[PDB]
């Protein structure tokens, strides 16, 4: 009914779109690095 957009279907065979599956959970994978970046030694230097 959603694919034919008409609320009413006659006799026959029709191909329908995808409305079945939907994601529910998220997967995040990152490399494990813990060294904080030298933002203090680059942005706030003695003499630019």
């Amino acid at each position: 009914k959603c694919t034919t957009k008409s609320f009413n279907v006659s006799k026959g065979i029709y191909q329908t779109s995808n409305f079945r599956v939907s994601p529910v959970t998220e997967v995040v994978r990152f490399p494990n690095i813990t060294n904080l970046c030298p933002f203090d030694k680059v942005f706030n230097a003695t003499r630019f």
Partner: protein, 49 residues
């Protein structure tokens, strides 16, 4: 003006004739081809419905 050619023998031949009748039927899904299984793209495709 007074000469005619008339055959005296015959032959039976078999000739093949190839003809296409049908081709491959095809169906196309709009949402899978246009939007790569992403929800943000499918929210804009509805205006092109």
């Amino acid at each position: 003006n007074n000469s005619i050619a008339i055959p005296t023998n015959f032959s039976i031949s078999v000739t093949t004739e190839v003809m296409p009748v049908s081709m491959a039927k095809t169906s196309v899904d709009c949402t899978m081809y246009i939007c790569g299984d992403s929800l943000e793209c499918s929210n804009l495709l509805l205006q092109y419905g």
